[model samples]
Target: TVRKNQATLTADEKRRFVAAVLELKRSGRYDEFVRTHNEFIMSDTDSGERTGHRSPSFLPWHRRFLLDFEQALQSVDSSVTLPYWDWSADRTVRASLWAPDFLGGTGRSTDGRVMDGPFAASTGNWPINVRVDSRTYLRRSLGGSVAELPTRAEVESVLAISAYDLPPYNSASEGFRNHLEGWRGVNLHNRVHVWVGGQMATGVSPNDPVFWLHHAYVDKLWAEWQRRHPDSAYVPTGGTPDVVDLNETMKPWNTVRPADLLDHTAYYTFDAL
Candidate 1:
């Protein structure tokens, strides 16, 4: 029940995680999550009826999404749990997180297609089924789109924000949620997606396995926020127009609410935090 850093995963851990992800992709279950994310990304807005990205629900919504994905992975291999990428530390393309045995390295220069890794197009085991483009292959161009990953200093500044969320909460909101969501502040989560490039840069990001790893770290940051500001919590507690209140039930799973997901330990903990 603990998520660890990607760089620290052992050979056996990496092998199992890769195999479990492949199994999910093989079973045709992975693409549905990708589709679900795309739906939310398109509909998420400040105006009305938002439940995924660009709102305060971003944190808790993704926490549930990662939990759903982690549960699916566990069904394939009980030992495999979602691992996170601390981009501040593993900011380089050469980081072990991109080894061929794991997620592979950057895409080639010609078409930005990945040439190696277990999920490489040539692998025959992994295929890009859910994507915006016609090409059906996993791809990545790490540090290609964005010059640099978020620095520790930048992340610290956002973490220092005291309020969970402010008025008219959305992409334009001035508070922790929007800051961490990377729309208004120094930019944390969204920049990593842009930095990854290829399929990961698109709305159907889950087509790349790195999407899970990326979100797991984003979820970890929310957990860290809880620890840093013990008195603070998810905002818009009730009756907030066009926003998912802390107690409001989230989409794709009507059973849980943001309030239920605030405690990471309830489902899992971070290896370090």
Candidate 2:
């Protein structure tokens, strides 16, 4: 269900995926995702409670959050699923996924208004309201920030951390959760965010369709980490106050927790090790 590379998706698969997302938007659930992400963007920073963005809970918290969003998309259309973007592979504007049918190509100079995709401004179907900046529309400059996307070998190194998470659990920690979350070791999430620039550099990142693709790949990296390190699992097992232990429930959706989302097989499969 989840996409490893954009080229793997058939035309029908792309259509169905777009339809599914459109349906969620029509049903009003899509906006909730926008709202939820906005809240987390502000809340997850170091200034506040720090649930996902900059805390030890970042990896699992975001894993849980992404699962929730993907499930919501599935609810509207069971056949639809999350597809990841290997930014490293498609580091150019001409990548097929950026065509008119998908997220559309990069925006124009000055403001970067996407002129192609189904969600283009002319459609009026997908408006870019509830944004972070004064500009109230979709914008992008592919490869604008940093030209390089993380290589497979680069990702392989991150998947190798074994300790789960070190003590103090602040920004510095070990294992997949911390490394992927980019708090402690070689930064993953934050660096990618910085690489995207624009809204990705700001609060309203979801406005860009690339955000989903980027995160989907990030999710895939987590799956890869699990496969590589079977013995090492989710961290901080019992009675931790602020931290959401391995089996504990994540906030906002207390009903379902990280435990429920630990296994990616329930949702989708990967390309290969």
Candidate 3:
């Protein structure tokens, strides 16, 4: 399988992708993904036990998480693969990724209700089934919260880092993991979430369909880091308390480990790398 850039996808490709996601939502299986992401983002804390976010395992955890979601989407349409959003290049509300035919544009100023595209609440194709609040409508304020997305030069700076991760392998850690996670450095991952606003900025980000494309690019960056620093790999090889060591098994899916997901080549390849 190949994960192509979202910008390059043909009109028909976009149609198929949206239809498959809509099929998942129609069958009532898509809400579980939102619930699952909410659970992990809450459980993976900076102080205590962590697995999904804000830790060394953040990269691998999301890698596997995206993989799981992609597999679920593939079950609906075999030709559908996760398309990545290279935000550095496509960094505005006007981007084709946000067109009415794709993920849709921004929401209204009053309540932030998205009025266009397949996932828009009026379409009845998408519903905010799993949410923290009562607002069961897809909301977004594209470019409303964050001024701009990360630049290509900024991505280069984070990629240039050599250490996979440092000691105290949490958000405080000074290395690629935390930097890419956006707790430090140029604020990569978290910044994009805030940029999208609405459901994306919350713990239940997967509720927004763009969450998949967002993480696909993040995973691509991790892959690029692996190639850039071949000698440098996941750190805290073993015996790191409250943190997942390189080889430790993560929660929910006890069968997979960080080391198991380090190389994405086993599953799929990116359009660029």
Candidate 4:
């Protein structure tokens, strides 16, 4: 029932939401999220028969991952759910999603330092549950990196990429996926990594406060893609060699499969699409 932009949550609702997230951290599930994500991000490349990120499974891989995370959230509190941050619409620091009630406002230009939000590096409660950094706490600098969040128009350009992913799939074959992952292309993941400019791009990206917001928007894009190509479905459907097939279960969560995640409606719904 609460599937939508989370900024609309009541203060009490938000408190409950924050408490649920923290509880997950206290139980050690939160750290597992960071570890799982980093493992896939690092391994999901076009090189050597891509399975997670660069391959056809990229879409489904992340879809399943987000769904798993959402389910984890719900486990803490059924009334709570994941809320996306449509960065394209909220291109500037002034976006309502960054309001104090939600993710909070942007930081100063001096250090990309964010001044608000529950994880404002000041709220000692929201620590970096998992990170590639030495410190185990949240960190942020609102406008720290040279990169800027992609505008609505920019995101539209990415959405317009009808090919789904560029040809010759491989980080070594072509720079497309790697670039799209933030190393090259328009700089999808890397730009955001740079935008956060802390532990975001490193092995410990979960350390940044903006991590969830960025991924929320990223998840939104996956939902958007599904709407655009409803019939396309997830790839590598059969028992294929060296590839993570649709029906084949993903690692860590050996119980689930990409096929199970093809339709996100099976798990949760979105506010927009």
Candidate 5:
């Protein structure tokens, strides 16, 4: 519980946490999650099946997915929990979160290869294993695609929507889910991916450690939306076709459903929720 902001993590916390992430990558477990996410992204369609993204389950799916990853991290270092990145506050490349001591700085123009930090190719600790492109090096282009991250006002506008999701609950839907998922309206989650550029802009975005931090904030927003609208809840409660209903179990793990994960207290709590 009480996941803290990446910028606030202590020096020792950063070292141990980064070590655990590198351990997971070295053990090959981390790449499997990357592959799993890519599979869902590739199979996702507007007309038919979709789970992890662009639908009502987007929030819950990632909630559980991040939980799984956190468990893996804990296995390596129990003190380490997934730290969120408040892109609204730490929006610039100069933020400490991008320092070479943590996730490294933006990739150089020559090949988009990270030049410093523990995950940089020069460190020989992190490798881009599960990737679509042939290049096998960690990369990032912070604030390269979009000039700025979504402001607090933009996030507030999307969070104010009462309906959980509208009909045709794919990316084009006009409801809270799609807007927060960043497929419509002011674009929240997806724009962050685009803003990161490099592997983060692709389906195998998990290749970057920043992927988890970005999504941890997105998941936190879902929790915030619930608190903001106490009466409003997830839609497609029953008899929905193709889309994952509130009660429907998600893929990769058939045990948990959106209804089971709406409450953040069931697993963990934010530092300031």
Candidate 6:
């Protein structure tokens, strides 16, 4: 099944997607995903082993991670597939994604507690059981931490990067991966996190349900980079210590390599490209 844009999904699609996510949480399966991502984010640094973020494997690592999450969602509801949120266009506290029926609205200023939506902590269905801080409720300060999300032009500039990754292969590198990762350029992915604020801006970002939708679009951007720079692919073609080489298996999934995940079509297609 193709992954549709969050903005385009019908009322029924939104309901099904939220229900599946809640089910996963209810089954004691979703919190582990949050823990896994937080662990990787905290451990992935510039000097030592890096797999999830800020490295060449960042794209592939997240690709497989999202795939695993989508598979989990599908198991809960076959009709439910991961949806992508185009933050560039839907950059606001009033977007449909924040509606009461879906992900809920901005958290109250007093404590950043989400007051609406299905994932609101008051619902009793969603509890911030897995976390790094004392606050457990799902917190979000839309446009609080950051002024605005990246624009179409900013995203296009990142897409224009020709190299999959450059030397160093970390956040310091100047390439498509780093730029899209939001460490060295217009701040695409990371900025979105900051824009959302609350748990989203924290290391345990997966605590927010929008984390999946946000990353789904980042994964889609990698595919778009592939489409634009067909000649440029994954780097570190051979032995590269610390960083994951093109064929080296990424951590958390020792069996899979970045080479095996370069093609998004092998798993699922996006609504657009």
Tens digits of lDDT, candidate 6, 126-242? 999888788879999999977989999999999998988998999999988999999997789999999999999998899999999999999998888899999998998999889
Stretches > 4 Å off in candidate 6: none
Alpha carbon deviation, residue 53, candidate 5 (Å): 1.1
CA lDDT scores, all candidates in order: 0.89, 0.70, 0.91, 0.62, 0.90, 0.92
TM-score of 5: 0.98
Q: Against the true structure, candidate 2 has what lDDT? A: 0.70
Residue 98 lDDT (model 6): 92
How well does each candidate superpose onto the true structure, as a TM-score?
0.98, 0.88, 0.98, 0.80, 0.98, 0.99
lDDT of 2 by residue, 128-240 (tens): 66675777666776667766556666666787777667655556555666677666555776667766665666677776656777787887777777777788776677766
Q: For each predicted model, how many residue pairs clash, with residues at least 3 apart or on different chains?
A: 0, 0, 0, 15, 0, 0
Candidate 4: regions farther than 4 A off: 105-116, 172-184, 236-242
Worst 10 residues of 2 by lDDT: 45-54
* Regions of model 1 farther than 4 Å from truth: none
lDDT of 5 by residue, 1-273 (tens): 568889899999999989999999999899999999999999888889888887888888999999999999999999899999999888889999999889989999988888999988877788888888999998788888888898999999998998889988998899888998888877888899998888999999999999999999999988898998999998889978888888888898999888999898988988897
Point to the candidate with the largest lDDT.
6
Q: Which ten residues in a row have the lowest lDDT in candidate 4?
A: 171-180
Cα lDDT tens digits for candidate 4, 29-73: 877877877877777554454555656565566666666776788
> Which scores better on lDDT, 3 or 6?
6
